[PDB]
Amino acid sequence: GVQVETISPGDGRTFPKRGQTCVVHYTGMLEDGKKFDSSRDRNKPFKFMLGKQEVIRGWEEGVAQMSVGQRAKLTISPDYAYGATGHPGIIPPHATLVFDVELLKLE
């Protein structure tokens, strides 16, 4: 149950592929409160791979669905985010996540 609301499309030819490593820079915000998951660029963005359940689903599917050079606003729901319940530290219970991601490159 994730949505992809693009703002600045990318070429529309290259995406993350099976056997690649995405190079993304995002900022995680919540419905209308604050940041819980940011990628404070300063110390290098975030980098992950497709098919090695290292990142939530909302991403995996979301980010995939995005193209090299595109930026979007994704909306993730419990089903994909972290399941149903989370932490009382970063992920309060049923607290939908919102990511504004920029897929930069593949490695």
PDB file of N, CA and C in Angstrom:
ATOM      1  N   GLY A   1       0.854  -1.217   0.000  1.00  0.00           N
ATOM      2  CA  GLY A   1       0.000   0.000   0.000  1.00  0.00           C
ATOM      3  C   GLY A   1       0.877   1.251   0.000  1.00  0.00           C
ATOM      4  N   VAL A   2       1.703   1.376  -1.010  1.00  0.00           N
ATOM      5  CA  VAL A   2       2.618   2.562  -1.128  1.00  0.00           C
ATOM      6  C   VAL A   2       2.226   3.321  -2.392  1.00  0.00           C
ATOM      7  N   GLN A   3       2.433   4.611  -2.381  1.00  0.00           N
ATOM      8  CA  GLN A   3       2.086   5.456  -3.571  1.00  0.00           C
ATOM      9  C   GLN A   3       3.335   6.215  -4.005  1.00  0.00           C
ATOM     10  N   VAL A   4       3.372   6.578  -5.261  1.00  0.00           N
ATOM     11  CA  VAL A   4       4.538   7.335  -5.824  1.00  0.00           C
ATOM     12  C   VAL A   4       4.001   8.612  -6.461  1.00  0.00           C
ATOM     13  N   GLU A   5       4.347   9.719  -5.868  1.00  0.00           N
ATOM     14  CA  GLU A   5       3.896  11.055  -6.381  1.00  0.00           C
ATOM     15  C   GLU A   5       5.151  11.785  -6.849  1.00  0.00           C
ATOM     16  N   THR A   6       5.459  11.605  -8.106  1.00  0.00           N
ATOM     17  CA  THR A   6       6.671  12.270  -8.654  1.00  0.00           C
ATOM     18  C   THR A   6       6.506  13.783  -8.761  1.00  0.00           C
ATOM     19  N   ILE A   7       7.636  14.442  -8.727  1.00  0.00           N
ATOM     20  CA  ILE A   7       7.696  15.932  -8.818  1.00  0.00           C
ATOM     21  C   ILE A   7       8.599  16.281  -9.999  1.00  0.00           C
ATOM     22  N   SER A   8       9.777  15.705  -9.996  1.00  0.00           N
ATOM     23  CA  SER A   8      10.772  15.961 -11.096  1.00  0.00           C
ATOM     24  C   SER A   8      11.191  14.668 -11.805  1.00  0.00           C
ATOM     25  N   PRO A   9      10.385  14.188 -12.719  1.00  0.00           N
ATOM     26  CA  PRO A   9      10.679  12.947 -13.479  1.00  0.00           C
ATOM     27  C   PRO A   9      12.164  12.771 -13.824  1.00  0.00           C
ATOM     28  N   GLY A  10      12.503  11.580 -14.246  1.00  0.00           N
ATOM     29  CA  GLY A  10      13.915  11.248 -14.628  1.00  0.00           C
ATOM     30  C   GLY A  10      13.876  10.928 -16.120  1.00  0.00           C
ATOM     31  N   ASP A  11      14.960  10.461 -16.685  1.00  0.00           N
ATOM     32  CA  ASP A  11      14.943  10.145 -18.139  1.00  0.00           C
ATOM     33  C   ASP A  11      13.669   9.384 -18.526  1.00  0.00           C
ATOM     34  N   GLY A  12      13.490   8.258 -17.887  1.00  0.00           N
ATOM     35  CA  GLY A  12      12.300   7.388 -18.139  1.00  0.00           C
ATOM     36  C   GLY A  12      12.778   6.162 -18.904  1.00  0.00           C
ATOM     37  N   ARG A  13      14.043   5.876 -18.735  1.00  0.00           N
ATOM     38  CA  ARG A  13      14.683   4.706 -19.416  1.00  0.00           C
ATOM     39  C   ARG A  13      15.439   3.830 -18.417  1.00  0.00           C
ATOM     40  N   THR A  14      16.088   4.418 -17.435  1.00  0.00           N
ATOM     41  CA  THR A  14      16.852   3.585 -16.437  1.00  0.00           C
ATOM     42  C   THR A  14      16.223   3.601 -15.051  1.00  0.00           C
ATOM     43  N   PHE A  15      16.208   2.436 -14.456  1.00  0.00           N
ATOM     44  CA  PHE A  15      15.642   2.243 -13.086  1.00  0.00           C
ATOM     45  C   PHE A  15      16.674   1.416 -12.312  1.00  0.00           C
ATOM     46  N   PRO A  16      16.491   1.199 -11.033  1.00  0.00           N
ATOM     47  CA  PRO A  16      17.254   0.134 -10.336  1.00  0.00           C
ATOM     48  C   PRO A  16      16.929  -1.232 -10.947  1.00  0.00           C
ATOM     49  N   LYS A  17      17.939  -2.028 -11.196  1.00  0.00           N
ATOM     50  CA  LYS A  17      17.738  -3.378 -11.785  1.00  0.00           C
ATOM     51  C   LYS A  17      18.168  -4.465 -10.794  1.00  0.00           C
ATOM     52  N   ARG A  18      17.840  -5.681 -11.147  1.00  0.00           N
ATOM     53  CA  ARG A  18      18.173  -6.848 -10.309  1.00  0.00           C
ATOM     54  C   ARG A  18      19.658  -7.173 -10.381  1.00  0.00           C
ATOM     55  N   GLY A  19      20.351  -6.678  -9.394  1.00  0.00           N
ATOM     56  CA  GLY A  19      21.827  -6.878  -9.279  1.00  0.00           C
ATOM     57  C   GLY A  19      22.512  -5.514  -9.218  1.00  0.00           C
ATOM     58  N   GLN A  20      21.750  -4.498  -8.889  1.00  0.00           N
ATOM     59  CA  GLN A  20      22.317  -3.109  -8.793  1.00  0.00           C
ATOM     60  C   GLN A  20      22.227  -2.603  -7.355  1.00  0.00           C
ATOM     61  N   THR A  21      22.875  -1.492  -7.131  1.00  0.00           N
ATOM     62  CA  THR A  21      22.901  -0.843  -5.779  1.00  0.00           C
ATOM     63  C   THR A  21      22.418   0.597  -5.941  1.00  0.00           C
ATOM     64  N   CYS A  22      21.252   0.882  -5.428  1.00  0.00           N
ATOM     65  CA  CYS A  22      20.723   2.269  -5.557  1.00  0.00           C
ATOM     66  C   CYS A  22      21.537   3.222  -4.690  1.00  0.00           C
ATOM     67  N   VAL A  23      21.605   4.432  -5.169  1.00  0.00           N
ATOM     68  CA  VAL A  23      22.341   5.532  -4.483  1.00  0.00           C
ATOM     69  C   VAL A  23      21.256   6.584  -4.369  1.00  0.00           C
ATOM     70  N   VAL A  24      20.642   6.635  -3.211  1.00  0.00           N
ATOM     71  CA  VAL A  24      19.534   7.617  -2.947  1.00  0.00           C
ATOM     72  C   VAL A  24      19.789   8.574  -1.778  1.00  0.00           C
ATOM     73  N   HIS A  25      19.193   9.732  -1.898  1.00  0.00           N
ATOM     74  CA  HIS A  25      19.304  10.798  -0.846  1.00  0.00           C
ATOM     75  C   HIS A  25      17.871  11.228  -0.580  1.00  0.00           C
ATOM     76  N   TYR A  26      17.445  10.995   0.631  1.00  0.00           N
ATOM     77  CA  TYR A  26      16.057  11.357   1.050  1.00  0.00           C
ATOM     78  C   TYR A  26      16.035  12.061   2.401  1.00  0.00           C
ATOM     79  N   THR A  27      14.831  12.389   2.760  1.00  0.00           N
ATOM     80  CA  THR A  27      14.548  13.065   4.041  1.00  0.00           C
ATOM     81  C   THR A  27      13.238  12.387   4.447  1.00  0.00           C
ATOM     82  N   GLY A  28      13.179  11.837   5.627  1.00  0.00           N
ATOM     83  CA  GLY A  28      11.915  11.162   6.069  1.00  0.00           C
ATOM     84  C   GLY A  28      11.175  12.070   7.043  1.00  0.00           C
ATOM     85  N   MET A  29       9.911  12.254   6.762  1.00  0.00           N
ATOM     86  CA  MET A  29       9.029  13.110   7.604  1.00  0.00           C
ATOM     87  C   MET A  29       7.796  12.261   7.897  1.00  0.00           C
ATOM     88  N   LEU A  30       6.963  12.735   8.780  1.00  0.00           N
ATOM     89  CA  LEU A  30       5.722  11.984   9.146  1.00  0.00           C
ATOM     90  C   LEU A  30       4.552  12.844   8.715  1.00  0.00           C
ATOM     91  N   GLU A  31       3.383  12.278   8.841  1.00  0.00           N
ATOM     92  CA  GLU A  31       2.130  12.992   8.465  1.00  0.00           C
ATOM     93  C   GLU A  31       2.217  14.502   8.622  1.00  0.00           C
ATOM     94  N   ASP A  32       2.434  14.910   9.838  1.00  0.00           N
ATOM     95  CA  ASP A  32       2.534  16.372  10.098  1.00  0.00           C
ATOM     96  C   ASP A  32       3.244  16.608  11.420  1.00  0.00           C
ATOM     97  N   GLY A  33       4.285  15.861  11.701  1.00  0.00           N
ATOM     98  CA  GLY A  33       5.007  16.068  13.002  1.00  0.00           C
ATOM     99  C   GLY A  33       6.467  16.468  12.837  1.00  0.00           C
ATOM    100  N   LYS A  34       7.282  15.490  12.565  1.00  0.00           N
ATOM    101  CA  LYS A  34       8.739  15.770  12.392  1.00  0.00           C
ATOM    102  C   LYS A  34       9.496  14.676  11.631  1.00  0.00           C
ATOM    103  N   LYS A  35      10.799  14.782  11.694  1.00  0.00           N
ATOM    104  CA  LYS A  35      11.682  13.792  11.011  1.00  0.00           C
ATOM    105  C   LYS A  35      12.001  12.659  11.982  1.00  0.00           C
ATOM    106  N   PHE A  36      11.983  11.485  11.418  1.00  0.00           N
ATOM    107  CA  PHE A  36      12.262  10.222  12.156  1.00  0.00           C
ATOM    108  C   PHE A  36      13.377   9.491  11.403  1.00  0.00           C
ATOM    109  N   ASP A  37      13.308   9.568  10.095  1.00  0.00           N
ATOM    110  CA  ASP A  37      14.327   8.901   9.209  1.00  0.00           C
ATOM    111  C   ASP A  37      14.931   9.837   8.160  1.00  0.00           C
ATOM    112  N   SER A  38      15.975  10.541   8.513  1.00  0.00           N
ATOM    113  CA  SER A  38      16.622  11.481   7.534  1.00  0.00           C
ATOM    114  C   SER A  38      17.950  10.865   7.088  1.00  0.00           C
ATOM    115  N   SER A  39      18.493  11.360   6.003  1.00  0.00           N
ATOM    116  CA  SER A  39      19.796  10.829   5.475  1.00  0.00           C
ATOM    117  C   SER A  39      20.821  11.956   5.361  1.00  0.00           C
ATOM    118  N   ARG A  40      20.972  12.670   6.451  1.00  0.00           N
ATOM    119  CA  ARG A  40      21.899  13.828   6.632  1.00  0.00           C
ATOM    120  C   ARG A  40      23.130  13.740   5.752  1.00  0.00           C
ATOM    121  N   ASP A  41      22.827  13.998   4.517  1.00  0.00           N
ATOM    122  CA  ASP A  41      23.821  13.996   3.395  1.00  0.00           C
ATOM    123  C   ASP A  41      25.271  14.121   3.878  1.00  0.00           C
ATOM    124  N   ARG A  42      25.522  15.197   4.583  1.00  0.00           N
ATOM    125  CA  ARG A  42      26.874  15.508   5.156  1.00  0.00           C
ATOM    126  C   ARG A  42      27.787  14.286   5.261  1.00  0.00           C
ATOM    127  N   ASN A  43      27.217  13.215   5.754  1.00  0.00           N
ATOM    128  CA  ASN A  43      27.974  11.934   5.924  1.00  0.00           C
ATOM    129  C   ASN A  43      27.481  10.918   4.893  1.00  0.00           C
ATOM    130  N   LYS A  44      27.601  11.314   3.654  1.00  0.00           N
ATOM    131  CA  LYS A  44      27.178  10.458   2.511  1.00  0.00           C
ATOM    132  C   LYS A  44      25.687  10.028   2.617  1.00  0.00           C
ATOM    133  N   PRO A  45      24.867  10.240   1.605  1.00  0.00           N
ATOM    134  CA  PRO A  45      23.511   9.632   1.535  1.00  0.00           C
ATOM    135  C   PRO A  45      23.412   8.169   1.951  1.00  0.00           C
ATOM    136  N   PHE A  46      22.368   7.569   1.450  1.00  0.00           N
ATOM    137  CA  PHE A  46      22.067   6.131   1.729  1.00  0.00           C
ATOM    138  C   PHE A  46      22.258   5.283   0.461  1.00  0.00           C
ATOM    139  N   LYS A  47      22.728   4.070   0.613  1.00  0.00           N
ATOM    140  CA  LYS A  47      22.945   3.171  -0.578  1.00  0.00           C
ATOM    141  C   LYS A  47      22.465   1.738  -0.299  1.00  0.00           C
ATOM    142  N   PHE A  48      21.551   1.217  -1.084  1.00  0.00           N
ATOM    143  CA  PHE A  48      21.065  -0.189  -0.833  1.00  0.00           C
ATOM    144  C   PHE A  48      20.888  -0.972  -2.142  1.00  0.00           C
ATOM    145  N   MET A  49      20.524  -2.226  -2.008  1.00  0.00           N
ATOM    146  CA  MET A  49      20.313  -3.116  -3.201  1.00  0.00           C
ATOM    147  C   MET A  49      18.888  -3.681  -3.250  1.00  0.00           C
ATOM    148  N   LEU A  50      18.473  -4.055  -4.437  1.00  0.00           N
ATOM    149  CA  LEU A  50      17.120  -4.625  -4.678  1.00  0.00           C
ATOM    150  C   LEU A  50      17.072  -6.153  -4.568  1.00  0.00           C
ATOM    151  N   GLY A  51      16.264  -6.637  -3.660  1.00  0.00           N
ATOM    152  CA  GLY A  51      16.123  -8.118  -3.459  1.00  0.00           C
ATOM    153  C   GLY A  51      16.862  -8.654  -2.232  1.00  0.00           C
ATOM    154  N   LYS A  52      17.315  -7.794  -1.353  1.00  0.00           N
ATOM    155  CA  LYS A  52      18.045  -8.264  -0.134  1.00  0.00           C
ATOM    156  C   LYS A  52      17.404  -7.630   1.106  1.00  0.00           C
ATOM    157  N   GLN A  53      16.096  -7.673   1.130  1.00  0.00           N
ATOM    158  CA  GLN A  53      15.266  -7.121   2.249  1.00  0.00           C
ATOM    159  C   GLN A  53      16.032  -6.394   3.357  1.00  0.00           C
ATOM    160  N   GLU A  54      16.691  -5.344   2.944  1.00  0.00           N
ATOM    161  CA  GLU A  54      17.504  -4.493   3.874  1.00  0.00           C
ATOM    162  C   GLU A  54      16.687  -3.231   4.151  1.00  0.00           C
ATOM    163  N   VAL A  55      15.883  -2.832   3.196  1.00  0.00           N
ATOM    164  CA  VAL A  55      15.042  -1.599   3.387  1.00  0.00           C
ATOM    165  C   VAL A  55      13.570  -2.009   3.396  1.00  0.00           C
ATOM    166  N   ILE A  56      12.757  -1.200   4.019  1.00  0.00           N
ATOM    167  CA  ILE A  56      11.302  -1.533   4.072  1.00  0.00           C
ATOM    168  C   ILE A  56      10.803  -1.816   2.652  1.00  0.00           C
ATOM    169  N   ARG A  57       9.540  -2.127   2.499  1.00  0.00           N
ATOM    170  CA  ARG A  57       8.977  -2.421   1.159  1.00  0.00           C
ATOM    171  C   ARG A  57       8.685  -1.098   0.447  1.00  0.00           C
ATOM    172  N   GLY A  58       7.852  -0.282   1.054  1.00  0.00           N
ATOM    173  CA  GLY A  58       7.469   1.059   0.500  1.00  0.00           C
ATOM    174  C   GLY A  58       8.573   1.641  -0.366  1.00  0.00           C
ATOM    175  N   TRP A  59       9.770   1.366   0.073  1.00  0.00           N
ATOM    176  CA  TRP A  59      10.976   1.851  -0.652  1.00  0.00           C
ATOM    177  C   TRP A  59      11.187   0.930  -1.843  1.00  0.00           C
ATOM    178  N   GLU A  60      11.694  -0.237  -1.510  1.00  0.00           N
ATOM    179  CA  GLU A  60      11.999  -1.316  -2.504  1.00  0.00           C
ATOM    180  C   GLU A  60      11.113  -1.181  -3.742  1.00  0.00           C
ATOM    181  N   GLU A  61       9.835  -1.159  -3.472  1.00  0.00           N
ATOM    182  CA  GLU A  61       8.842  -1.027  -4.544  1.00  0.00           C
ATOM    183  C   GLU A  61       8.892   0.441  -4.970  1.00  0.00           C
ATOM    184  N   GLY A  62       8.720   1.319  -4.015  1.00  0.00           N
ATOM    185  CA  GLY A  62       8.753   2.766  -4.338  1.00  0.00           C
ATOM    186  C   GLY A  62      10.003   3.124  -5.138  1.00  0.00           C
ATOM    187  N   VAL A  63      11.124   3.174  -4.468  1.00  0.00           N
ATOM    188  CA  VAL A  63      12.387   3.514  -5.176  1.00  0.00           C
ATOM    189  C   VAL A  63      12.492   2.828  -6.537  1.00  0.00           C
ATOM    190  N   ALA A  64      12.271   1.541  -6.590  1.00  0.00           N
ATOM    191  CA  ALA A  64      12.360   0.850  -7.914  1.00  0.00           C
ATOM    192  C   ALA A  64      11.622   1.636  -8.995  1.00  0.00           C
ATOM    193  N   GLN A  65      10.371   1.737  -8.676  1.00  0.00           N
ATOM    194  CA  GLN A  65       9.348   2.422  -9.486  1.00  0.00           C
ATOM    195  C   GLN A  65       9.869   3.799  -9.893  1.00  0.00           C
ATOM    196  N   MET A  66      10.964   4.226  -9.300  1.00  0.00           N
ATOM    197  CA  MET A  66      11.514   5.585  -9.688  1.00  0.00           C
ATOM    198  C   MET A  66      12.674   5.387 -10.676  1.00  0.00           C
ATOM    199  N   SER A  67      13.013   6.420 -11.412  1.00  0.00           N
ATOM    200  CA  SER A  67      14.135   6.328 -12.418  1.00  0.00           C
ATOM    201  C   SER A  67      15.331   7.221 -12.096  1.00  0.00           C
ATOM    202  N   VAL A  68      16.457   6.734 -12.541  1.00  0.00           N
ATOM    203  CA  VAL A  68      17.749   7.431 -12.347  1.00  0.00           C
ATOM    204  C   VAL A  68      17.715   8.905 -12.738  1.00  0.00           C
ATOM    205  N   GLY A  69      17.579   9.769 -11.766  1.00  0.00           N
ATOM    206  CA  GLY A  69      17.538  11.239 -12.056  1.00  0.00           C
ATOM    207  C   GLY A  69      16.160  11.783 -11.713  1.00  0.00           C
ATOM    208  N   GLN A  70      15.364  10.962 -11.076  1.00  0.00           N
ATOM    209  CA  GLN A  70      13.978  11.400 -10.684  1.00  0.00           C
ATOM    210  C   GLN A  70      13.878  11.623  -9.188  1.00  0.00           C
ATOM    211  N   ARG A  71      12.941  12.477  -8.863  1.00  0.00           N
ATOM    212  CA  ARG A  71      12.670  12.835  -7.443  1.00  0.00           C
ATOM    213  C   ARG A  71      11.179  12.724  -7.230  1.00  0.00           C
ATOM    214  N   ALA A  72      10.868  12.202  -6.080  1.00  0.00           N
ATOM    215  CA  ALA A  72       9.426  12.010  -5.707  1.00  0.00           C
ATOM    216  C   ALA A  72       9.113  12.126  -4.230  1.00  0.00           C
ATOM    217  N   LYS A  73       7.833  11.996  -4.004  1.00  0.00           N
ATOM    218  CA  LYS A  73       7.224  12.053  -2.647  1.00  0.00           C
ATOM    219  C   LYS A  73       6.417  10.762  -2.551  1.00  0.00           C
ATOM    220  N   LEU A  74       6.939   9.832  -1.800  1.00  0.00           N
ATOM    221  CA  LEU A  74       6.248   8.514  -1.631  1.00  0.00           C
ATOM    222  C   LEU A  74       5.495   8.522  -0.298  1.00  0.00           C
ATOM    223  N   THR A  75       4.446   7.748  -0.248  1.00  0.00           N
ATOM    224  CA  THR A  75       3.604   7.639   0.987  1.00  0.00           C
ATOM    225  C   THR A  75       3.582   6.152   1.307  1.00  0.00           C
ATOM    226  N   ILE A  76       4.064   5.779   2.465  1.00  0.00           N
ATOM    227  CA  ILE A  76       4.089   4.332   2.862  1.00  0.00           C
ATOM    228  C   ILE A  76       3.123   4.101   4.008  1.00  0.00           C
ATOM    229  N   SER A  77       2.450   2.984   3.924  1.00  0.00           N
ATOM    230  CA  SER A  77       1.436   2.571   4.959  1.00  0.00           C
ATOM    231  C   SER A  77       1.975   1.351   5.736  1.00  0.00           C
ATOM    232  N   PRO A  78       1.524   1.127   6.951  1.00  0.00           N
ATOM    233  CA  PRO A  78       2.056   0.032   7.804  1.00  0.00           C
ATOM    234  C   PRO A  78       2.388  -1.263   7.050  1.00  0.00           C
ATOM    235  N   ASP A  79       1.439  -1.733   6.292  1.00  0.00           N
ATOM    236  CA  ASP A  79       1.634  -2.982   5.519  1.00  0.00           C
ATOM    237  C   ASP A  79       3.030  -3.101   4.922  1.00  0.00           C
ATOM    238  N   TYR A  80       3.515  -1.998   4.413  1.00  0.00           N
ATOM    239  CA  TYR A  80       4.867  -1.957   3.783  1.00  0.00           C
ATOM    240  C   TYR A  80       5.933  -1.359   4.722  1.00  0.00           C
ATOM    241  N   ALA A  81       5.661  -0.210   5.282  1.00  0.00           N
ATOM    242  CA  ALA A  81       6.657   0.422   6.204  1.00  0.00           C
ATOM    243  C   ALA A  81       7.420  -0.557   7.091  1.00  0.00           C
ATOM    244  N   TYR A  82       6.895  -0.792   8.265  1.00  0.00           N
ATOM    245  CA  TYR A  82       7.546  -1.731   9.233  1.00  0.00           C
ATOM    246  C   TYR A  82       6.580  -2.830   9.690  1.00  0.00           C
ATOM    247  N   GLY A  83       5.473  -2.955   9.004  1.00  0.00           N
ATOM    248  CA  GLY A  83       4.450  -3.999   9.352  1.00  0.00           C
ATOM    249  C   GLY A  83       3.170  -3.379   9.917  1.00  0.00           C
ATOM    250  N   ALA A  84       3.018  -3.499  11.213  1.00  0.00           N
ATOM    251  CA  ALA A  84       1.820  -2.951  11.929  1.00  0.00           C
ATOM    252  C   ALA A  84       2.267  -2.047  13.075  1.00  0.00           C
ATOM    253  N   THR A  85       3.131  -2.581  13.898  1.00  0.00           N
ATOM    254  CA  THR A  85       3.667  -1.819  15.075  1.00  0.00           C
ATOM    255  C   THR A  85       5.159  -1.556  14.859  1.00  0.00           C
ATOM    256  N   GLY A  86       5.666  -0.563  15.542  1.00  0.00           N
ATOM    257  CA  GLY A  86       7.115  -0.192  15.428  1.00  0.00           C
ATOM    258  C   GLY A  86       7.762  -0.053  16.805  1.00  0.00           C
ATOM    259  N   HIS A  87       8.434   1.057  16.983  1.00  0.00           N
ATOM    260  CA  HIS A  87       9.140   1.372  18.271  1.00  0.00           C
ATOM    261  C   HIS A  87       8.438   2.558  18.957  1.00  0.00           C
ATOM    262  N   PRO A  88       8.653   2.749  20.236  1.00  0.00           N
ATOM    263  CA  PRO A  88       8.313   4.016  20.928  1.00  0.00           C
ATOM    264  C   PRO A  88       9.559   4.911  20.949  1.00  0.00           C
ATOM    265  N   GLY A  89      10.342   4.825  19.904  1.00  0.00           N
ATOM    266  CA  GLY A  89      11.594   5.644  19.801  1.00  0.00           C
ATOM    267  C   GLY A  89      11.694   6.361  18.455  1.00  0.00           C
ATOM    268  N   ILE A  90      11.566   5.601  17.396  1.00  0.00           N
ATOM    269  CA  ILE A  90      11.651   6.163  16.002  1.00  0.00           C
ATOM    270  C   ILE A  90      10.315   5.961  15.303  1.00  0.00           C
ATOM    271  N   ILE A  91       9.829   4.755  15.428  1.00  0.00           N
ATOM    272  CA  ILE A  91       8.514   4.378  14.792  1.00  0.00           C
ATOM    273  C   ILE A  91       7.413   4.051  15.818  1.00  0.00           C
ATOM    274  N   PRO A  92       6.824   5.048  16.431  1.00  0.00           N
ATOM    275  CA  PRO A  92       5.523   4.899  17.146  1.00  0.00           C
ATOM    276  C   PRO A  92       4.610   3.900  16.403  1.00  0.00           C
ATOM    277  N   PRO A  93       3.638   3.324  17.063  1.00  0.00           N
ATOM    278  CA  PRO A  93       2.685   2.399  16.398  1.00  0.00           C
ATOM    279  C   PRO A  93       1.979   3.114  15.243  1.00  0.00           C
ATOM    280  N   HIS A  94       1.297   2.334  14.433  1.00  0.00           N
ATOM    281  CA  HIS A  94       0.536   2.843  13.241  1.00  0.00           C
ATOM    282  C   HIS A  94       0.795   4.314  12.897  1.00  0.00           C
ATOM    283  N   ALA A  95       2.034   4.622  12.612  1.00  0.00           N
ATOM    284  CA  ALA A  95       2.434   6.024  12.259  1.00  0.00           C
ATOM    285  C   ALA A  95       2.997   6.072  10.844  1.00  0.00           C
ATOM    286  N   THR A  96       2.089   6.096   9.903  1.00  0.00           N
ATOM    287  CA  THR A  96       2.419   6.145   8.440  1.00  0.00           C
ATOM    288  C   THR A  96       3.759   6.867   8.202  1.00  0.00           C
ATOM    289  N   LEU A  97       4.547   6.464   7.232  1.00  0.00           N
ATOM    290  CA  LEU A  97       5.847   7.140   6.975  1.00  0.00           C
ATOM    291  C   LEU A  97       5.737   7.888   5.634  1.00  0.00           C
ATOM    292  N   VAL A  98       6.484   8.952   5.493  1.00  0.00           N
ATOM    293  CA  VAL A  98       6.462   9.744   4.223  1.00  0.00           C
ATOM    294  C   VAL A  98       7.920  10.022   3.859  1.00  0.00           C
ATOM    295  N   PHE A  99       8.301   9.655   2.666  1.00  0.00           N
ATOM    296  CA  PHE A  99       9.710   9.881   2.201  1.00  0.00           C
ATOM    297  C   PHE A  99       9.746  10.772   0.946  1.00  0.00           C
ATOM    298  N   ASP A 100      10.698  11.668   0.893  1.00  0.00           N
ATOM    299  CA  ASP A 100      10.836  12.570  -0.298  1.00  0.00           C
ATOM    300  C   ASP A 100      12.210  12.103  -0.736  1.00  0.00           C
ATOM    301  N   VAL A 101      12.207  11.229  -1.716  1.00  0.00           N
ATOM    302  CA  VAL A 101      13.496  10.655  -2.241  1.00  0.00           C
ATOM    303  C   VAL A 101      13.935  11.117  -3.614  1.00  0.00           C
ATOM    304  N   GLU A 102      15.230  11.045  -3.767  1.00  0.00           N
ATOM    305  CA  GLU A 102      15.902  11.430  -5.040  1.00  0.00           C
ATOM    306  C   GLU A 102      16.809  10.258  -5.462  1.00  0.00           C
ATOM    307  N   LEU A 103      16.418   9.478  -6.447  1.00  0.00           N
ATOM    308  CA  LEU A 103      17.310   8.339  -6.861  1.00  0.00           C
ATOM    309  C   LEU A 103      18.409   9.045  -7.631  1.00  0.00           C
ATOM    310  N   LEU A 104      19.616   8.861  -7.158  1.00  0.00           N
ATOM    311  CA  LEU A 104      20.797   9.513  -7.804  1.00  0.00           C
ATOM    312  C   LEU A 104      21.494   8.661  -8.843  1.00  0.00           C
ATOM    313  N   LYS A 105      21.941   7.503  -8.441  1.00  0.00           N
ATOM    314  CA  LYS A 105      22.642   6.606  -9.391  1.00  0.00           C
ATOM    315  C   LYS A 105      22.611   5.151  -8.934  1.00  0.00           C
ATOM    316  N   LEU A 106      23.100   4.286  -9.786  1.00  0.00           N
ATOM    317  CA  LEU A 106      23.139   2.824  -9.474  1.00  0.00           C
ATOM    318  C   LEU A 106      24.612   2.420  -9.457  1.00  0.00           C
ATOM    319  N   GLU A 107      24.941   1.532  -8.559  1.00  0.00           N
ATOM    320  CA  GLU A 107      26.355   1.039  -8.429  1.00  0.00           C
ATOM    321  C   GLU A 107      26.368  -0.485  -8.292  1.00  0.00           C
TER     322      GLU A 107
END
